[PDB]
Design brief:
heteroheptamer, A mainly beta, B mainly beta, C mainly beta, D mainly beta, E mainly beta, F mainly beta, G mainly beta, C: mainly beta, Immunoglobulin-like, seven-stranded mixed sheet, five-stranded antiparallel sheet, F: mainly beta, 2 domains, 2 helices, about 5% helix, binds 2-acetamido-2-deoxy-beta-D-glucopyranose, viral protein/immune system
Amino acid sequence: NFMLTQPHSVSESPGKTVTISCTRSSGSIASNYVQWYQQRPGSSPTTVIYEDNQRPSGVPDRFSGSIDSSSNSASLTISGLKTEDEADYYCQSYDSSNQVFGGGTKLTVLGQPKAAPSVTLFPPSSEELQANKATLVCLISDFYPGAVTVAWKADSSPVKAGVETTTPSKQSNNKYAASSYLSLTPEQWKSHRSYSCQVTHEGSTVEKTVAPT
Amino acid sequence: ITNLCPFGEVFNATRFASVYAWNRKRISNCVADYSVLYNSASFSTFKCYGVSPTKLNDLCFTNVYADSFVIRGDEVRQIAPGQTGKIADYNYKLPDDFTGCVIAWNSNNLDSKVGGNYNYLYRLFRKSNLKPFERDISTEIYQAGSTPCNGVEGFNCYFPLQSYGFQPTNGVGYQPYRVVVLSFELLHAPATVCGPKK
Amino acid sequence: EVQLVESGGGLVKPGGSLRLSCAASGFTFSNAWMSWVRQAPGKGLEWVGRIKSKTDGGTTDYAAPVKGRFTISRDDSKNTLYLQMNSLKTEDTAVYYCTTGSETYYYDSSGPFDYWGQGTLVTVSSASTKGPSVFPLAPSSKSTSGGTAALGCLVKDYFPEPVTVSWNSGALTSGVHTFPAVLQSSGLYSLSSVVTVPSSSLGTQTYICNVNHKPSNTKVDKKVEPK
Amino acid sequence: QVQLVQSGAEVKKPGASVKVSCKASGYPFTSYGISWVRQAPGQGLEWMGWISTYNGNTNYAQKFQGRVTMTTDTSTTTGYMELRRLRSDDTAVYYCARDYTRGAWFGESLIGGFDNWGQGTLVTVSSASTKGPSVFPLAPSSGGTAALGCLVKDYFPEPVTVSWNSGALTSGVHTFPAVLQSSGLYSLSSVVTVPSSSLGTQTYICNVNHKPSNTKVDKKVEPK
Amino acid sequence: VQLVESGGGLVQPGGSLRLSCAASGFTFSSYDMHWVRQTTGKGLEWVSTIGTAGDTYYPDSVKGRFTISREDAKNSLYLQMNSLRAGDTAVYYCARGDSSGYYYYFDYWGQGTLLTVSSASTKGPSVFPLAPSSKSTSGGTAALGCLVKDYFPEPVTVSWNSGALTSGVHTFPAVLQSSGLYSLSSVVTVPSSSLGTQTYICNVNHKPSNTKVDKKVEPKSC
Amino acid sequence: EIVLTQSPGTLSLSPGERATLSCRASQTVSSTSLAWYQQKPGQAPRLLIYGASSRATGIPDRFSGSGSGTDFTLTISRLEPEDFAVYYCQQHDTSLTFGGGTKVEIKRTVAAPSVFIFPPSDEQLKSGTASVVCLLNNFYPREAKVQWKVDNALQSGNSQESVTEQDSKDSTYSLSSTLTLSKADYEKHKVYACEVTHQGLSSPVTKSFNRGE
Amino acid sequence: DIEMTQSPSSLSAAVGDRVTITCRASQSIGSYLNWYQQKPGKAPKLLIYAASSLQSGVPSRFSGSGSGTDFTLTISSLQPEDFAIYYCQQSYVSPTYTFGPGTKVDIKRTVAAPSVFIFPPSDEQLKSGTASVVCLLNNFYPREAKVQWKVDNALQSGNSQESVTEQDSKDSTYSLSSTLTLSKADYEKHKVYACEVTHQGLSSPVTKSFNRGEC
Ligand SMILES: *[C@@H]1O[C@H](CO)[C@@H](O)[C@H](O)[C@H]1NC(C)=O
């Protein structure tokens, strides 16, 4: 019946405080109870607020809900920010005949140690060249923050065709990983003396190079 | 002559009022038995204000008012002197000097229903709190913002009443409770309502 | 203690049909309202529909994009929830969770969503299943035969997700990393697994990656030798 | 302890009136309503209405509007139901009952019912005049067990009473409920199963009495 | 008007007991009656009321665990007590209820009876004379007393010469000893010239063991 | 009004069996506003149940009310021999209405009617009226088909039937079918018969006479 | 459900002082406020009902006032017998009648030196193998006294326990018992038994002593 409007993302340093809003599009926010949920990547959600400002047993008091009738909005205030708060947050409420979620708010903790990428590069395999293909495989790991650029070379020329490259993903050790794949023909791999994978991170650059051997 | 006070016709009533439109039954010129009110197995709440419950048999009153309505178990704690919250503030206010008793029981078996009992209402908004025993039954669209509502709903313009979601599966606090409030009056007039003369 | 487990979900074509099931445990399933909630890739939570308790009248409510297309039902005898899904679309591509809350906090056949399962993936695409090619990423024949080397497997041109990879039939776990897949312009996925190993072992130890693509039943053991 | 006691039976012609009483006892009169119900012979309960013992307020079923008038005296603690403009479809057993379906003070719906009832008052409405039964033998004829009887015809009002052999014969006896004939007069039969071996040696006699007319007819029943 | 409590003593955790209160010098059946308790440090708690109309009242600390009753034909009040916890250890008073119109109050209280909820056994005291001597004497006055030792639980009670001596009497609060048993002393200052002419006896009473000891304290001549 | 259908109208159960009587409303009745009544043979009715479920004072615990909305049920956990009676439901949700009623009767074994026939007495014929009686003596169940035939012509309109209550000894019924004619219409014909069909009979038992033999 | 508070918690005043005690209800209770007096080992006595109405046979020096949230008990001139804990009680909300935590009134006496006495064990206790040596500080003020047991002039520790009275209702002094306890064998291993008292009413620590067998 109604919809719930959230800010797409919010971002703040450890030990500070953030607020996430949840604006009801139609009818009073206070008509029915508003809940909030926490979801970490590769996990199901969990209740963090119920009934506007109640907490389920085991949730830290750091997390607190509220309602403003003026801006027709629920809110979730999160205080003393911790590395574990790095999660996606949702509000939900209901009508007698439908349950309604908010669009989501991505939380990130602006203050964790910088880490340069561990980079590895593999050449096309004999089996893949016998299958009349070639893939240069560049693997990028253990970096923070989770933002990198990757730029291939054929001896010195910047390669742009045949490149397929991942948006980075968070590893088990809070750092990030990414994959980059330069597709070639078996002859392109051998017309050049060498191919390199260059990775740029916080302005610094890390390189591996390989040749037909 | 010595007609009994009709407390049965408020406790034993089939259907109760919505709390925004609370019912008031006036009682006069009768002999009261309070024995029906003692040792009550069904009453989740029996509390008295300005009188001892024992002493109801010892006393006489000019009028007695039996007010009656349904609310949640959670909200019965608002039906008292010096209370605030949506029910105390916008539906049924008792004064701070109240002489009377407040009585309540769970009624999930009378007032919940398959497909829900959305028929019991509460006032969600008012421009001020209620005065004690003020009864507001206005259905005027509550203006919450700077923009006039011109009598219709929309952005910051909401219906002033909300239905209770009395589904049978409601948790104990969230179930309907029947509430009866016995206001005891004493005035200049001969005290028409007395306990048992024996 | 409370546990929810979804079943069904996979690759299906537009206009097609599926049925999801969810087994429930550790609470009064009879007393519970139950709802399905779905999550589209890289996006938020959408409520699909609700079924109230038998005690409430057992009726079902539905969101706008799925009404007259999906149907929720329950077998209380098997403490099981269902979602029938017909006339499927690209937009129905999501992880589907079964959900409810604690009996303590119920109002209007609703409350907090305290309880979620694992979630089953539904992929609605005109594309058919494609099994991967598995190629050995041989250790770079330099270093020195006293240090560390790295070797791997390329799992290439497959659809849909997921791929699973292990080393030496599960006997090699330390120093193993398996990277997120790239979704290629071709609509196919390519993924890499890598492990760090003693150089001095490369002439005497057998290194094998084991690959498992359940959407095709493609299972491939690939030996990773030196050059 | 609680009791309701109603007026005795009344016979009436059409157009006339009847005033059934309901003397209440053993409860606080002015705390409960009085509901009134009637039952036509051999069928169900027709509700007539309700009255407050406290404030005289009434409710009547549509069928009785402008014919019924209920009243309560609080001094003798007695309810009454007066019914005027009588006719054949007013022939019924009328009951009063102590009411907890509606409040006597505030006239609102209650969790309860018609809890204590009166013994009932039979009222019969007919053009017919008091007549004793024409008694006719139902003769047996010619293996081991036979049956014989008396037709007890064209009497008004109810009832007749019939023994066999001055009460000495009771086993195997059946008396049937009376049928009202189109003539406005009642008719029934009394019958008895008897040993055939002793048909021509035992005396059989039906002992008809019609208390409303003081008619007595001991009709002998033999073969022909 | 008087009220007198009885049935106080030692009870085991999870256990049960019935307190009793006798009323005198008023028409008992005309008045509301109450039980109120005092823990050593947690203040005063109302625990039950019984009115004149068979009407009974309890707080949720007590609901279903205790049960109040009156025998008007015996001018007497009771509290049945079940599922007794360490935290029910208190002095239990009975009190009369009365009211100046609307304004309700507890106009008369009894002396209280002590209930101890602990997993121990009761023991009667030993009573030893603290005999008066020159070492007990100053300015025409002498101190004498009774040491009441090694009992459990409280209360011990002491009076002198059947209660006929109360001036100059000091009875000390009980010391819990390292043995888990209690001890106290009762002492009295008397004229030193009264010794050997007057007799002095400490009348000791311990309800939790039914021990009563009338210990004569003989004077020393030195 | 709200109309109350009871079913079945007659309910044949054994002594000691559990009686279960249906009352069903044309609308959803307030669960606070339904009542049930017992009417024993030759007595005024007594309240059994109020508020759909609460038994009245002095009603034995074998009686119980149940159900809600449209569908309500009176359980008698055991039929004691005193409970072979008529039962009514009632509502005061909307105006006040009684149910059609349900008789409970002793579930007997089948019993064949001892069929007898009786001509009009000459004392009756002198008056200008003639009554012919057919007696179905000591039978069960109640349902029998009594065809009056006169010179092979089937009779209708000119007959009335009367039936006993269930006999206190053998728990069986008995029935008097009665044909009535003028003296002239009785004398117009020769052969008089009642054909009885009933469950206890392997074929219809006809009893007959010739007028004047 | 109307928690009740009192101020001050504890008070010390002279004989003659106007002592004023306050009570606050967590809700308005109109005039439904009662006041009680309790003394050590006694039944609470009702002093005041309806915030101000004095109970029958209460000294007219007791008075009470206030309405709504805030209430007073005033003793117009404190007397030695007024040593007590004073409690307020709401009578507005029933049956759950709530009491305030109380206010103790100690008497600020003038100094009194302890009349100090020592007792040997009884011959009965010594036959039961035990020796409780008792020391009595009778009618002293203030309550702060240091007692010291000595045996053959050797300082004693851990083998003595003490009990002090509450304040006296007439002279407003205190008394203190100190009790050394020994085995018959430890009692018989020594000659001299002494109790030394240090108190601000004594120009120097006062010893009382006996020789084991003197009397
Ligand atoms: C209402 O009536 C019932 C009987 O139907 C009776 O038991 C009860 O005492 C009454 N209750 C009150 C509070 O009057």
